[PDB]
């Protein structure tokens, strides 16, 4: 009988979930965002599509920071992406109260993994149709995770999502084979903007704005901040030179 796709907890006869599959389709309708993992940290990048000239430059923060060293970027619905960051901020704040030292990257993924999964178990609430990419510098090495609408996640050496997810992920495989031993944090900043322009062929019909934020122990020393000054303009001219 019809109705397998009406509710959430109802399982399809093929073994899938329609509410989960339809939530993944909403991920590809938003602005694209990528990420690059390094030895001493991770690098985040996002392409915000500018609607009209009425947008004031650099007043829209796409990458929201949880605690200090934990960055978060999402591609999908705006409220679903901001709710995970606001919920993840309370998890990082409640952790430091009892547990002292801040929560690492692999442990923070379990907070959002169980929280998003709790929405798919009940029909009272809906899952998140946004893909959140979070990471940073933990106590040992570094880690990067991409939260899927289904709640599934693993360690990602690179991440691609959004409209340009097809062409952006193909460029991440070239960066791994280029530097198989290791990649510096300063070189990944210019490589992050280059992949965005290579994935801009699908989004080229509108205006774009570059926003990059990286965290590592080489310069900021455990601090996740954006890129300001001549460092942002240097990565633009280097990436657009190959075009």
- Residue 66 makes CB contacts below 8 A (sequence gap 6+) with 72, 85, 88, 89, 92, 108, 134
Determine if 166 is a binding residue for other proteins (CB under 8 A): no
- The least distance separating other proteins from the CB of residue 42, rounded to whole angstroms, comes to 12
Sole binder of other proteins in the list 90, 176, 184, 240 (CB under 8 A): 176
Which residues, at least 6 apart from 235, have a Cβ–Cβ distance to it below 8 Å? 189, 190, 192, 193, 210, 212, 227
CA-nearest of 236, 206, 188, 200 to 35 is: 188
**Residue among 8 and 191 whose Cβ is closer to other proteins:** 8
Pick the stretch among 82-90, 189-197, 203-211, 212-220 that binds other proteins (CB under 8 A): 82-90
Piece of the chain touching other proteins by CB under 8 A; list 106-114, 131-139, 196-204, 211-219? 106-114
Residues annotated as part of the active site? 31
**Cα separation of 213 and 243, whole Å?**
23
Residue 121 binds other proteins, judged by CB under 8 A: yes
Residue 162 near residue 48 (C-beta atoms within 8 A): no
Question: Treating both helix axes as pointing N-terminal to C-terminal, what angle do 185-198 and 230-241 enclose, rounded to 10 degrees?
Answer: 50
99 is a site residue for other proteins (CB under 8 A): no
Binding site for other proteins (CB under 8 A): 1-16, 18-19, 22-23, 25-26, 28-29, 52-56, 59-60, 77-80, 82-83, 86, 106, 110, 113-114, 116-126, 129, 143, 148, 150-159, 169, 172-173, 176
């Amino acid at each position: 009988g019809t109705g397998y796709d009406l509710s959430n907890s109802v399982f399809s006869p093929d073994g899938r979930n329609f509410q989960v599959e339809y939530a993944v389709k909403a991920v590809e309708n938003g602005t694209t965002s990528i990420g690059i993992k390094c030895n001493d940290g991770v690098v985040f990048a996002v392409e915000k599509l500018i609607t009209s000239k009425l947008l004031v430059p650099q007043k829209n923060v796409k990458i929201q920071v949880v605690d200090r060293h934990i960055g978060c970027v999402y591609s999908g619905l705006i409220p679903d992406g901001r709710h995970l960051v606001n919920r993840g901020r309370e998890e990082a704040a409640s952790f430091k109260k009892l547990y002292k030292t801040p929560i690492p990257i692999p442990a923070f993924a379990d907070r959002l993994g169980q929280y998003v999964q709790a929405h798919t178990l009940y029909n009272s609430v809906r899952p998140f149709g946004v893909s959140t990419i979070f990471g940073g510098v933990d106590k040992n090495g570094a880690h990067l995770y991409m939260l899927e609408p289904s709640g599934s996640y693993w360690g990602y050496k690179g991440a691609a999502t959004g409209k340009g997810r097809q062409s952006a992920k193909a460029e991440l495989e070239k960066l791994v084979d280029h530097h198989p031993e290791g990649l510096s944090a300063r070189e990944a900043v210019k490589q992050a903007a280059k992949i965005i322009y290579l994935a801009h062929e699908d989004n080229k019909e509108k205006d774009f704005e570059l926003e990059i934020s990286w965290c590592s122990l080489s310069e900021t020393n455990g601090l996740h901040k954006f890129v300001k000054g001549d460092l942002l303009q240097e990565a633009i001219d280097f990436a657009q030179k190959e075009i």
